[PDB]
């Protein structure tokens, strides 16, 4: 079976490259972040513009939702993270402590903590209520390209240009595993599978890989796209068929069959690098966003 994703909406408004798109867990909203220093909110099902959220002083590279869809955290070049109340648009907290650009961010499932990764080569863990840095992980020896909590928040996976993926025990800070193949290309994205058993990792050699991290083994490899320059998000599409979804530097959205590794769809329309894809939590919907010769978000819908 192959998906039949088809373009439903293009969403425009950001005045510079879009960095990140994320669907709210309750499925009503898409949040977009951009080099133009702005967060924008759109309806998930029609892409209707809802509001702009602002306050960061430099461009934004990531945004993530709290589990209750009430809060957003953003990661900015201004070396801060901001906790936002979506409904009011106010900045609730400014998270300071990184000494270089903040590049990536995520809530834990309970949404009482935020993880961040920075150009300063560290991972930071933040208390959402107080906005205080709980812990700093000297996580890597190069910029941290992604950080992600597992299904219950007890683990953090980070990726870095130093070529490593590291799994951290959230509470103890201990590095439980360091993962690397037989080469060391920069790792530009990583995230746990929904079941927590795997990490999906992008490396800047045009390769995605599915690792059983417990066993420390690569179970699947996905190729055919173009990824050598940008930290492009990748997804497990789970609502219908089990796909792997990623943007690509040839301006396409790639969709692979997770089991077989075959490319099953390529979504055309973007006119620049598709930096970010997101999968709707209940509907077979993909959101994708592109860099500075495009600056738009597209919503794609599939029957399966």
């Amino acid at each position: 079976v192959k998906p039949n994703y088809a373009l439903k909406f293009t969403l425009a408004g950001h005045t510079k490259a879009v960095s990140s798109v994320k669907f709210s867990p309750n499925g009503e909203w898409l949040a977009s972040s951009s080099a133009d220093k702005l967060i924008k909110i759109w309806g998930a099902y029609d892409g209707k513009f809802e509001k702009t959220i602002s306050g960061h002083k430099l461009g934004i590279s990531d945004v993530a939702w709290s589990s209750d869809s009430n809060l957003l955290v953003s990661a900015s070049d201004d070396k801060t993270l901001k906790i936002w109340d979506v409904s009011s648009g106010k900045c609730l907290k400014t998270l300071k402590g990184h000494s270089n650009y903040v590049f990536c961010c995520n809530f834990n499932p309970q949404s009482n903590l935020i993880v961040s990764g920075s150009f300063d080569e560290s991972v930071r863990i933040w208390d959402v209520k107080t906005g205080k840095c709980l812990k700093t992980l000297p996580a890597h020896s190069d910029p941290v390209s992604a950080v992600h909590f597992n299904r219950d928040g007890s683990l953090i996976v980070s990726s870095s240009y130093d070529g490593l993926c590291r799994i951290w025990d959230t509470a103890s800070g201990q590095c439980l595993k360091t993962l690397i193949d037989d080469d060391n290309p920069p790792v530009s994205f990583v995230k746990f599978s929904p079941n927590g058993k795997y990490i999906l990792a992008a490396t800047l050699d045009n390769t995605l890989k599915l690792w059983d991290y417990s066993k420390g083994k690569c179970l699947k490899t996905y190729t055919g796209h173009k990824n050598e320059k940008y930290c492009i998000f990748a997804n497990f599409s789970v609502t219908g068929g089990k796909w792997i979804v990623s943007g690509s530097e040839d301006n396409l959205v790639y969709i692979w069959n997770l089991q077989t590794k075959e490319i099953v769809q390529k979504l055309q329309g973007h006119t620049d690098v598709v930096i970010s894809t997101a999968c709707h939590p209940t509907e077979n919907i993909i959101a994708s966003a592109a860099l500075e010769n495009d600056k738009t978000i597209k919503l794609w819908k599939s029957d399966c």
């Binding site: 490259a17 960095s19 951009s34 080099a35 590279s61 650009y101 590049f103 940008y230 930290c231 930096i275």
Partner: peptide, 5 residues
């Protein structure tokens, strides 16, 4: 910075 090569 994610938007930069």
């Amino acid at each position: 910075m994610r938007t930069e090569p």
